[PDB]
Design a protein around this ligand. Structure first.
Ligand SMILES: *[C@@H]1O[C@H](CO)[C@@H](O[C@@H]2O[C@H](CO)[C@@H](O[C@@H]3O[C@H](CO[C@H]4O[C@H](CO[C@H]5O[C@H](CO)[C@@H](O)[C@H](O)[C@@H]5O[C@H]5O[C@H](CO)[C@@H](O)[C@H](O)[C@@H]5O)[C@@H](O)[C@H](O[C@H]5O[C@H](CO)[C@@H](O)[C@H](O)[C@@H]5O[C@H]5O[C@H](CO)[C@@H](O)[C@H](O)[C@@H]5O)[C@@H]4O)[C@@H](O)[C@H](O[C@H]4O[C@H](CO)[C@@H](O)[C@H](O)[C@@H]4O)[C@@H]3O)[C@H](O)[C@H]2NC(C)=O)[C@H](O)[C@H]1NC(C)=O
Ligand SMILES: O=C(CCN1CCc2nc(NC3Cc4ccccc4C3)ncc2C1)c1ccc2[nH]c(=O)oc2c1
Ligand SMILES: *[C@@H]1O[C@H](CO)[C@@H](O)[C@H](O)[C@H]1NC(C)=O
Ligand SMILES: [Cl-]
Ligand SMILES: [Zn+2]
Ligand SMILES: [Zn+2]
Ligand SMILES: [Zn+2]
Length: 783
């Protein structure tokens, strides 16, 4: 740690130097390792950041922050407005938009460089609301490629989101699950303020700068020390862009603490917010004028991106656990816009998580939070598979805070809430030679950007949570060619092979060709793991029956706009019929359900939607049967009897694909038969942790679902298979007052269902695979 070395000719060097030698890079301040003369040499401030008429053609002075001398361009250190003030040029923002059909790079450049310009707490609505005070940002947005909004990851905090942007991973996977964290294995705490965050043990996955370097692409610095002014960060980027071909980095990142810092104090739309926005825009202008005078403004790819949004949150809107709990001083709480509950460590043997959950469950009529055990949280949040995530979680309502007691105004804004909340949405703008011209694209999740950034730099992305090819429609060229995954298990197509007399399933029933075309509209789902399964055809539906799980992996059926809804006849209530195509040994039995005093059963294809009374008997086949708790049957029967027809009538028919999910380890991935921890009493019948449905129809609703030309439209859910309805505070009332609300909370992407089942959907369509990938990543928000 020898500080006696100098920074002379080493200011913001890109080669990192280890001990004893002192550092002259931007992170040297954060690690307290700079050479004695770092601030003096590298952080000059004299005469400001702008050229004036009088300074034009000046004699070079070492003391100045930036220069207005004739040699500054070749030295790559002019003030960004040099050519405008001195050489009579115009500001980039004043020029009309001209399409960049090919990169116009100076000789020597291997590829167009990438500049990631990141802004903290920049909410999606600032683009429209602040447009008049942001002309540079408006030019980038209007003449490049932009999304109306970009969805952040949960929690909608800085560190989990910036690290998701860099890696393409969910927080539960990269390890930065919050701004404040406690790892029980390390017995250490990660905080916004402190030296523990600098330890590399916390940061999982492979960020973009490591992906680049490992593939021989030079990466500039992503993390900047707070003491480095935004003008110096911009000039450092421009100076690095002026380096010789063999030293010049290809990927750069700028970061602005604003508008977040002001947002917390003044709220998202506080009158004080106009100045920070004008400032961010001025910084954009400086970068753009700086690139123009270096002849790079039609060669560099620029990404203007945010990490999260900002909501109106005051301390008057605070919910206290001391109003629900007796032992509030005997618990540790990560408070605010989310809640994570832990017991206090010493002499607290009476701590019961079940008592804390019960006392936080539907207690006040207007309660502004909901408790959950992390494995019961909506699957779309991907917030469970990490030891740094406490078992007790509190999902707090937008505009609300959670605190322990009145003991614990200053703030008018905050963020961290569910990532589907409007105020939490952020921005995406792509501008440059590889992005499209004057193009608007649909909203997407920030997990997807890492693959795009690799593509823009010709890199091979590390394994991540993005779906490579889903964002090809953003690019003019340098597109990745995606290929469908190969089917691992081929299906069996059984015929009639068994006699009714062979079946002693303890089941009783008073029961004395054009299917694939109508009910399987996008081909059969591909099974991407090793297993034994049968395709079963029926008049009203088709299924893929698992011999190992003794139930369908999937059930596919089309419900037209005009379909008639019938009831289950009184004499068929407890009817279960054997399927003469499937062996009694590969079949479920009624005796297991009679002997399970907590478990009942349901059907994947709804008997309520049968085409005829004759066809209705197929719905009662033992092979359409699935285990269901009585409480869950209330949810499932309402969905099947009421909601499927409602959707068919609203969407001009629907195609439904339903089935079970097994995720006992809550990792978001399909369980192997050895991971199943619950079976129907004294049986091989596994209990699903969740039930899914994929509801597809035509984007052009004037076309019926079964005769659709053009893009598709989808909505999906992953319902938790619970023995009670404590999640729904009005569950004592009629299902029409609570079931649909539950389902909206548990909305999912087709891609989320694919990970959990090992299935591959939409294999036989008239659409391009890139378009199908975009469809699979779609989340229906009801927001
Ligand atoms: C989102 O996308 C994710 C990424 O694809 C998915 O997560 C992956 O899930 C799988 C399955 O669960 C898991 O695979 C297992 O890996 C076990 C070994 O794990 C360690 O190594 C990997 C790989 O390390 C490489 O990459 C990193 C950079 O990412 C690099 O730093 C390493 O040096 C190493 O480099 C090599 O590869 C890179 C390219 O990636 C090259 O550039 C390089 O040259 C080298 O070739 C790590 O990623 C793991 O990291 C976890 O653990 C550390 C320490 O705890 C954390 O810091 C980190 O955040 C991460 O934690 C998360 O995952 C673990 C589980 O791994 C959770 O428990 C935790 O809660 C977090 O969520 C490890 O350090 C291996 O043992 C295992 O083997 C099993 O299967 C084989 C069959 O193949 C059997 O034979 C065995 O018996 C085992 O049963 C299996 O292969 C991945 O590790 C995991 N990756 C990550 C990043 O989490 C995720 O599922 C997906 N989400 C959804 C919902 O789809
Ligand atoms: O801790 C802080 C402020 C300190 N920041 C943290 C993030 C950071 N990122 C970068 N580089 C980016 C560029 C980039 C681009 C792509 C991918 C990764 C990255 C990394 N450089 C410096 C800093 C310093 C904080 C801020 C807001 C808060 N809001 C709140 O509620 O708490 C808050 C705490
Ligand atoms: C839960 O509520 C009951 C009744 O108000 C109370 O007796 C009990 O102490 C509470 N438990 C906790 C842990 O807050
Ligand atoms: Cl946090
Ligand atoms: Zn932030
Ligand atoms: Zn913040
Ligand atoms: Zn699993």
């Amino acid at each position: 740690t020898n500080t006696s070395g100098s920074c002379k000719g080493r200011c913001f060097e890109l080669q990192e130097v280890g001990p004893p030698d002192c550092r002259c890079d931007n992170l040297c301040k954060s690690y307290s390792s700079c050479c004695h003369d770092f601030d003096e040499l590298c952080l000059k401030t004299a005469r400001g950041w702008e050229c004036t008429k009088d300074r034009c053609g000046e004699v070079r002075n070492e003391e100045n922050a930036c220069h207005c001398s004739e040699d500054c361009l070749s030295r790559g250190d002019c003030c960004t407005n040099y050519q405008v003030v001195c050489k009579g040029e115009s500001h980039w923002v004043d020029d009309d938009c001209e399409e960049i059909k090919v990169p116009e790079c100076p000789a020597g450049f291997v590829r167009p460089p990438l500049i990631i310009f990141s802004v903290d707490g920049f909410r999606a609505s600032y683009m429209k609301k602040g447009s008049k005070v942001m002309p540079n940002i408006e030019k980038l947005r209007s003449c490049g490629t932009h999304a109306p909004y970009m969805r952040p990851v949960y929690p909608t905090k800085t560190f989990p989101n910036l690290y998701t942007l860099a890696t393409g991973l969910y927080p539960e996977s990269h390890g930065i699950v919050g701004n404040s964290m406690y790892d029980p294995v390390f017995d250490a705490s990660f905080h916004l303020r402190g030296r523990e965050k600098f330890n590399h043990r916390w940061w999982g996955g492979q960020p973009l700068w490591i992906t680049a370097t490992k593939q021989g692409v030079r990466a500039g610095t992503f993390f900047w020390s707070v003491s480095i002014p935004h003008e110096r960060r911009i000039l450092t980027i421009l100076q690095w862009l002026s380096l010789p071909d063999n030293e010049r980095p290809s990927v750069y990142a700028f970061y602005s603490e604003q508008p977040d810092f002001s947002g917390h104090k003044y709220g998202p739309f506080g009158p004080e917010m106009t100045n920070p926005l004008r400032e961010i825009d001025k910084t954009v202008g400086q970068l753009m004028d700086g690139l123009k005078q270096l002849r790079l403004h039609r060669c560099v790819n620029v990404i203007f991106v945010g990490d999260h949004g900002m909501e109106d949150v005051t301390c008057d809107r605070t919910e206290f656990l001391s109003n629900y709990l007796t032992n509030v001083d005997d618990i540790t709480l990560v408070p605010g816009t989310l809640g994570r509950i832990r017991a206090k460590s010493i002499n607290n043997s009476k701590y019961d998580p079940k008592t804390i959950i019960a006392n936080l469950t539907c207690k006040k009529p207007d309660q502004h939070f909901k408790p959950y055990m992390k494995q019961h949280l909506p699957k779309r949040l991907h917030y469970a598979n990490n030891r740094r995530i406490e078992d007790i979680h509190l999902l707090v309502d937008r505009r609300w805070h959670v605190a322990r007691k009145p003991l614990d105004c200053f703030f008018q804004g905050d963020h961290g809430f569910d990532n589907k909340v409007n105020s939490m949405q952020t921005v995406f703008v792509g501008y440059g030679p590889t992005f499209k011209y004057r193009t608007k694209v649909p909203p997407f999740e920030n997990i997807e950007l890492y693959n795009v950034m690799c593509d823009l730099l010709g890199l091979k992305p590390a394994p991540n949570n993005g779906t490579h090819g889903s964002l090809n429609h953003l690019l003019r060229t340098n597109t990745f060619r995606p290929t469908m995954p190969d089917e691992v298990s081929r299906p069996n197509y059984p015929g009639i092979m068994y006699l009714q007399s062979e079946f002693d399933l303890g089941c009783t029933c008073d029961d004395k060709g054009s299917t694939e075309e109508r009910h399987l509209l996008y081909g059969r789902p591909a099974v991407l793991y090793r297993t034994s399964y049968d395709i079963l055809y029926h008049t009203d539906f088709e299924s893929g029956y698992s011999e190992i799980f003794l139930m369908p992996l999937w059930t596919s059926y089309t419900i037209s706009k005009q379909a008639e809804v019938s009831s289950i006849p009184e004499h068929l209530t407890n009817c279960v019929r054997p399927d003469v195509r499937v062996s009694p040994g590969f079949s479920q039995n009624c005796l297991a359900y009679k002997n399970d005093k907590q478990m009942s059963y349901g059907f994947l294809f709804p008997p309520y939607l049968s085409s005829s009374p004759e066809a209705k008997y197929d719905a009662f086949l033992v092979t359409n049967m699935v285990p269901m708790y009585p409480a869950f049957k209330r949810v499932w029967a309402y969905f099947q009897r009421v909601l499927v027809k409602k959707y068919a009538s609203e969407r001009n028919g629907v195609n439904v694909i339903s089935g079970p999910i097994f995720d006992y380890n809550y990792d978001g991935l399909r369980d192997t038969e050895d991971e199943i921890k619950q079976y129907v009493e004294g049986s091989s019948i596994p209990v699903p942790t969740h039930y899914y449905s994929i509801i597809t129809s035509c984007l052009d609703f004037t076309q019926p679902a079964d005769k659709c030309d053009g893009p598709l439209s989808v909505s999906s859910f992953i319902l938790p298979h619970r023995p009670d309805n404590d999640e729904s505070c009005n569950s004592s009332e009629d299902e029409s007052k609570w079931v649909e609300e539950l389902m909206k909370m548990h909305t999912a992407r087709v891609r989320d269902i694919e990970h959990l089942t090992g299935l591959d959907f939409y294999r036989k369509t008239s659409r391009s695979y890139s378009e199908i990938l975009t469809l699979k990543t779609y989340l229906h928000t009801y927001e």
